[PDB]
Amino acid sequence: AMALIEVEKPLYGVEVFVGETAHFEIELSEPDVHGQWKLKGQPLAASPDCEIIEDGKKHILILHNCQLGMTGEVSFQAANTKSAANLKVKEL
Amino acid sequence: GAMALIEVEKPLYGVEVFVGETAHFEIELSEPDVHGQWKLKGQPLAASPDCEIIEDGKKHILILHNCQLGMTGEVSFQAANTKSAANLKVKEL
Amino acid sequence: LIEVEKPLYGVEVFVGETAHFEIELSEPDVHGQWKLKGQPLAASPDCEIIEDGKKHILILHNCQLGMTGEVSFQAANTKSAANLKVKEL
Amino acid sequence: GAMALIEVEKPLYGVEVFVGETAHFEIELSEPDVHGQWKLKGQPLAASPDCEIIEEGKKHILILHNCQLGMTGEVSFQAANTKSAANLKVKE
Amino acid sequence: GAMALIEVEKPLYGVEVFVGETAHFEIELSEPDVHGQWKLKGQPLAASPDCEIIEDGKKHILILHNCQLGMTGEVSFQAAQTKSAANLKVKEL
Amino acid sequence: GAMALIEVEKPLYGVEVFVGETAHFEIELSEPDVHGQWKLKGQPLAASPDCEIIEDGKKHILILHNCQLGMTGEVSFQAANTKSAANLKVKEL
Ligand SMILES: [Zn+2]
Ligand SMILES: [Zn+2]
Ligand SMILES: [Zn+2]
Ligand SMILES: [Zn+2]
Ligand SMILES: [Zn+2]
Ligand SMILES: [Zn+2]
Ligand SMILES: [Zn+2]
Ligand SMILES: [Zn+2]
Ligand SMILES: [Zn+2]
Ligand SMILES: [Zn+2]
Ligand SMILES: [Zn+2]
Ligand SMILES: [Zn+2]
Ligand SMILES: [Zn+2]
Ligand SMILES: [Zn+2]
Ligand SMILES: [Zn+2]
Ligand SMILES: [Zn+2]
Ligand SMILES: [Zn+2]
Ligand SMILES: [Zn+2]
Ligand SMILES: [Zn+2]
Ligand SMILES: [Zn+2]
Ligand SMILES: [Zn+2]
Ligand SMILES: [Zn+2]
Ligand SMILES: [Zn+2]
Ligand SMILES: [Zn+2]
Known about the structure:
The complex is a heterohexamer, with 4 copies of chain A, 1 copy of chain D and 1 copy of chain E. Chain A is mainly beta. Chain A has strands at about 5-10, 15, 20-30, 35-40, 40-45, 50-55, 60-65, 70-80, 80-90. Chain A has a single domain (about 1-90), classed as Sandwich (Immunoglobulin-like), CATH 2.60.40.10. In chain A, about 0% of the residues lie in helices and about 55% in strands. In chain A, the strands form 2 sheets. Chain A has a 5-stranded mixed β-sheet with strand order 2-9-8-4-5, with no helix packed on it. The radius of gyration of chain A is 13 Å and the shape is elongated. Chain D has a single domain (about 1-90), classed as Immunoglobulins (Immunoglobulin-like, Sandwich), CATH 2.60.40.10. Chain D is about 0% helix and about 55% strand. Chain D is elongated, with a radius of gyration of 13 Å. Chain E has a single domain, classed as Immunoglobulin-like (Sandwich). In chain E, a hairpin with a 2-residue loop joins strand 4 (about 35-40) and strand 5 (about 45). Chain E is elongated. The interface of C and E includes residues 27, 30 and 31 of C. The PDB classes it as metal binding protein. Keywords: metal binding protein, calmodulin-binding, cytoskeleton, immunoglobulin domain, serine/threonine- protein kinase, structural protein.
């Protein structure tokens, strides 16, 4: 009988101008848990411009060269644990 | 600044599994600690008790428990510019 | 007390094929050691010893008749064993 | 035999944030699993809730929450032989 | 969530070494993957070839090569809440 | 897939230790995340409270607590290709 994984620090919303970078972070209740990030409900492919990072209880997503079409919900799920927040891309 | 592309050193290979059995896939990259993404039939896979995604140094492993007929198709993996694919054949015994 | 959450399970393989064992512990990053027939296992191309979080994995490639026997694992205080059966096709 | 020196592959670049927001810095090394040290205005950074030091593979990240005008200055990183610096500007 | 503070499961022990020799310190925390900082005589340690900072799961290690007499003093470690200290004594033959 | 063999970059050094104290061995390989095996007098080490096996990037470390006279002899490490050996010398104060 083991505890389900929980979100200790949820995702916060990010604002970013076109071409700049957005960073998201979430902290889980326990280290080394596997999860998956989505943007506007579509799973993210890792790329030079989309970097998926894990370090202990922390999960980080780095989105470089953000574009207007990217505005919408960023979400993360690792088993039971789920969090979501808004990404707003602005022009100047 | 001069860095080698990530390459596949040992590629995915095909597996045949009977229904209800588990299948495992593995690939070895040229560099350790490279983030990898797995897909089955073109759909990105997420970790769960029956779909375990494993990373250890240069090795990437996918374990699929309780395989079902409808899972037959291409398993693919991508890590940086490194890509590999092989077939999952589930047989009805 | 570090516990075993999902124990080793037995596996059957044909000669030449690969066998995989797996165990899930209650805690991640615990140093694990594997044995086959009571003999400690070193990593090699045909014997791959994997750790990722709570999961420990042993992959045995090109299995041979003489390898039939008990596969066992220990991490801190937790122990688990199961059988490898290699058979001719 | 010959071992390559660790190099900076993707250097630190400057970040500008407004007072009270968080700034994220990012550097990529030529090799994974290299132990790195961060500094802000020449002082070694101590990991905290507001000051998070992250490593994953070739990637090293520094997150500074609730930035203050007094924190404007040079952020530097060093790992083995590799060094990078960029500016944190907290904007009024 | 409601999380336990990091604790010290096994504290630093004192080390004594002759000059030129290496000292090794070891502390075990209650949780793996916790980030910490080492200090020597109250000063943050920079990680040269002679000063190696190591982490593996719940264990944190400091290796100091080529110890000199000036290094005699308190070695401390801090990871969030968790803190420990022990004496380094450097002796002349 | 055209890959370099793992090599020892920093070999094991010999350690002298008094009875009851702890000995610390370290070796550095040419690549991080390589799996290896430690031996004492040609016998594989079983990890225990007094026998700790540590990995961190290119570094491999062995910690032997509460050293006893009978433990004197060769300590070795091998990672596939790579092998290094050094002497453990336990003495009475
Ligand atoms: Zn940011
Ligand atoms: Zn971990
Ligand atoms: Zn970390
Ligand atoms: Zn980046
Ligand atoms: Zn416009
Ligand atoms: Zn090539
Ligand atoms: Zn990753
Ligand atoms: Zn499984
Ligand atoms: Zn490993
Ligand atoms: Zn219990
Ligand atoms: Zn249980
Ligand atoms: Zn398998
Ligand atoms: Zn280990
Ligand atoms: Zn393999
Ligand atoms: Zn993992
Ligand atoms: Zn060399
Ligand atoms: Zn480190
Ligand atoms: Zn944070
Ligand atoms: Zn020592
Ligand atoms: Zn050293
Ligand atoms: Zn290399
Ligand atoms: Zn690594
Ligand atoms: Zn110890
Ligand atoms: Zn490390």
